[PDB]
Design a protein around this ligand. Structure first.
Ligand SMILES: CC(C)C[C@H](N[C@@H](Cc1cncn1Cc1cc(F)cc(Cl)c1)C(=O)O)C(=O)O
Ligand SMILES: *[C@@H]1O[C@H](CO)[C@@H](O)[C@H](O)[C@H]1NC(C)=O
Ligand SMILES: *[C@@H]1O[C@H](CO)[C@@H](O)[C@H](O)[C@H]1NC(C)=O
Ligand SMILES: *[C@@H]1O[C@H](CO)[C@@H](O)[C@H](O)[C@H]1NC(C)=O
Ligand SMILES: [Cl-]
Ligand code: NA
Ligand SMILES: [Zn+2]
Length: 677
């Protein structure tokens, strides 16, 4: 019969696929832990094997009727195996795309910028630039790191990324999607299950609908933060303008988390940022992941495996190897679970341990499922599980209990405004960032944004949707999207939007099962086996049930709903509306840090623009050797042109960028050399 054959086919495929998957997984591990030419080669071979095997089983599965399946377990598996991806591309195309992927990945993880005053002092993104963007209060140095990274590293990514889009769109349009974007939204698709179906376009709509309901609380968080940042960087921020992109606590403003030291509502209270308490005790990466383990075990979940501790890399290896430091949770297969994290002793590395270990715990739970279904019910479910736990672990109640807040820490209504504020800087601050990033990639893949307008459109969407403005104008030799890990390392990003809605929904139903009474934000599901079982019973399903039904069985809703996330932040919202009565709320897209020094302008090609920039640079060189008696090697690069028969420009001193030249000064220089034409 058909079923009995297919049953044995999928049974054989699943076990054969596990062992080939373990092989490329493990080769990807060694590459990521030990970036090396050899390991790139062992990776590429192991992957080539995996891909060729899938192409074989893909065609060999296209035989078994795509329809006529008795056990729906034995149907969706087939449906995936019949989609012969990658192989749609020629062997020349496919090897090129894998080369582009390894090149982007390698550039991003090895990219370095150097101090202009000391060329032998160079800085990786992790930890050097990251540490500057987390901690420096210097506007200029934060500018240097932000622009260096996008001009030394992002520019290397621009041409590769253009090819990446061409190749990925071809593999997708041949796998029968509208483009790579649509291929990605396919992670959320449910078909053939009435009352639980979900279409790829539904994802766009639900995301845009919910994002409307989140704007007000974002706008007020944006207004409060702007005001505080006007205090921390006096005279640099317009009270109706967008926030400068280098002033947000990390390289991109993905999270506004590190702005807590500048935005804390009630600085006199005991610190709810427990970084210092970890440093003052003997907290290392071992202690951190041991504490995260305690939490999942108190909830009823298993400990980590022996292999996990044996094979993870929870610290920076050193100068003995180059490793992708991005926290990542790996399910290599065959009971092999491990985490890659260059863990530091901050509260942020501490909540991230819980998040990454959440991935592991989900991976563990659905190990007992067929290989083809060993996945999240969708990608947001997977990202939400670590965050559920992170919500409980960040509560001052929980922190007090693991000795990081004094035993005398008094919960009052000012500490909760502090806690809710910090939470908002992470959770709410990231939602516009995330939506706008993915909205951009979705549009690039659909073809709605031409290549000559990628950066133009990118910084228009930053200003408009995010309330963030670039501090330096960027032309189409940049690829600012790709300077973030997820974009240069080819990962979807809506998982971070959808996990944020999911996580409060799940937190709501878990706090009820944990016999919580009171507001959601005071809830810590620690020690609740009833909470753990409710969650586990869903985790152990993998992707065997559609996610709409998996959501229903845990929280009683078929779809994502933003009501729980807003209830969580209701106290803080009220307080923010009060704190902002004398602030502007919203932003104008027109102000930019550099427009108050710019100058407008009267067959024209880029080479004309090159002679122009070179002339202005030359003019400047004279005007400082003449009207000032100095020699300054102004380059064409130091002439920054924006808003391009018309354009606006300003001049910066070479090796400083922040050092804009007074608009009145450049004018005299232009006049002084106006004779030469
Ligand atoms: C393969 C990917 C999809 C993995 C992806 N990694 C997380 C990492 C993380 C978790 N909590 C916060 N972060 C951000 C962060 C970045 C960083 F460099 C250092 C630190 Cl301490 C934190 C993510 O990017 O969100 C995931 O697990 O989703
Ligand atoms: C890193 O990779 C190189 C090349 O494969 C290898 O010789 C070296 O021993 C590796 N180092 C570690 C620590 O694995
Ligand atoms: C906290 O409580 C006091 C009175 O106990 C009140 O005046 C204040 O508005 C409350 N909220 C704060 C301080 O955010
Ligand atoms: C760059 O310009 C700023 C302008 O405020 C100045 O304060 C800073 O010292 C300069 N940095 C240099 C020249 O390295
Ligand atoms: Cl470094
Ligand atoms: Na920033
Ligand atoms: Zn994650």
């Amino acid at each position: 019969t058909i079923e009995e054959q297919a049953k044995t086919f999928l049974d054989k495929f699943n076990h054969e696929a596990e062992d080939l998957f373990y092989q490329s997984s493990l080769a990807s591990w060694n590459y990521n832990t030990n970036i090396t030419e050899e390991n790139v080669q062992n990776m590429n071979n192991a992957g080539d094997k995996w891909s060729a095997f899938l192409k074989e089983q893909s065609t060999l599965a296209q035989m078994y009727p795509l329809q006529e399946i008795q056990n729906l377990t034995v149907k969706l598996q087939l449906q995936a195996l019949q989609q012969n991806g990658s192989s749609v591309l020629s062997e020349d195309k496919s090897k090129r795309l894998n080369t582009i992927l390894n090149t982007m990945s390698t550039i991003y993880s090895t990219g370095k910028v150097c101090n202009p005053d000391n060329p032998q002092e160079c800085l990786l993104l992790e930890p050097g630039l990251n540490e500057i963007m987390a901690n420096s209060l210097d506007y200029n140095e934060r500018l240097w790191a932000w622009e260096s990274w996008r001009s030394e590293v992002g520019k290397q990514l621009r041409p590769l990324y253009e090819e990446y889009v061409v190749l990925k769109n071809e593999m997708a349009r041949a796998n029968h999607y509208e483009d790579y974007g649509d291929y990605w939204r396919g992670d959320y698709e449910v078909n053939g299950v009435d009352g639980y179906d979900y279409s790829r376009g539904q994802l766009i709509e639900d995301v845009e609908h919910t994002f409307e309901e989140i704007k007000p609380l974002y706008e007020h968080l944006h207004a409060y933060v702007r005001a505080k940042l006007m205090n921390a960087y006096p005279s640099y921020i317009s009270p109706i303008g967008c926030l400068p992109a280098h002033l947000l606590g990390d390289m991109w403003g993905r999270f506004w988390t590190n702005l807590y030291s500048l935005t804390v509502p009630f600085g006199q209270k005991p610190n709810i940022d427990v970084t210092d308490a970890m440093v003052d005790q003997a907290w290392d990466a071992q202690r951190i992941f041991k504490e995260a383990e305690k939490f999942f075990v108190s909830v009823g979940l298993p400990n980590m495996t022996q292999g996990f501790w044996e094979n993870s890399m929870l610290t920076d290896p050193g100068n003995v190897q180059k490793a992708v430091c991005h926290p990542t949770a790996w399910d290599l297969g065959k009971g092999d679970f491990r985490i890659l994290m260059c863990t530091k002793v901050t509260m942020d590395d501490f909540l991230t341990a819980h998040h990454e270990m959440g991935h592991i715990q989900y991976d563990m739970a659905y190990a007992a499922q067929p290989f083809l279904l060993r996945n999240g019910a969708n990608e947001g479910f997977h990202e939400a599980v670590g965050e559920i736990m992170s919500l409980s672990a960040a509560t001052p109640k929980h922190l007090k209990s693991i000795g990081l807040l004094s035993p005398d820490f008094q919960e009052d209504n000012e500490t909760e405004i502090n806690f809710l504020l910090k939470q908002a800087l992470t959770i709410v601050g990231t939602l516009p960032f995330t939506y706008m990033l993915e909205k951009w990639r979705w549009m690039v893949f659909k073809g709605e944004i031409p290549k000559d307008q990628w950066m133009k459109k990118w910084w228009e969407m930053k200003r408009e949707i995010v309330g963030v403005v670039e501090p330096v104008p960027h032309d189409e030799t940049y690829c600012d999207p790709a300077s973030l890990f997820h974009v240069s390392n080819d990962y979807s990003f809506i998982r971070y939007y959808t996990r944020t809605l999911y996580q409060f929904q799940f937190q709501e139903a878990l706090c009820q099962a944990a016999k919580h009474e009171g507001p959601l934000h005071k809830c810590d599901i620690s020690n609740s086996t009833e909470a753990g079982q409710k969650l586990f019973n869903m985790l152990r399903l993998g992707k065997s049930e559609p996610w709409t039904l998996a959501l229903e069985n845990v929280v009683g809703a078929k779809n994502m709903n933003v009501r729980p996330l807003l209830n969580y932040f209701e106290p803080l919202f009220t307080w923010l509306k009060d704190q902002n009565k004398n602030s502007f709320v919203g932003w104008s897209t027109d102000w930019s840090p550099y427009a108050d020094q710019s100058i407008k302008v009267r067959e024209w090609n880029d080479n004309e623009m090159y002679l122009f920039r070179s002339s202005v640079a030359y003019a400047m060189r004279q005007y400082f050797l003449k009207v000032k008696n100095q020699m300054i090697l102004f380059g064409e690069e130091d002439v920054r042109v924006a808003n391009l028969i018309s354009f606006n420009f300003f001049v910066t001193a070479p090796k400083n960028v922040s050092d804009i030249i007074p608009r009145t000064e450049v004018e005299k220089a232009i006049r002084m050399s106006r004779s030469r034409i």
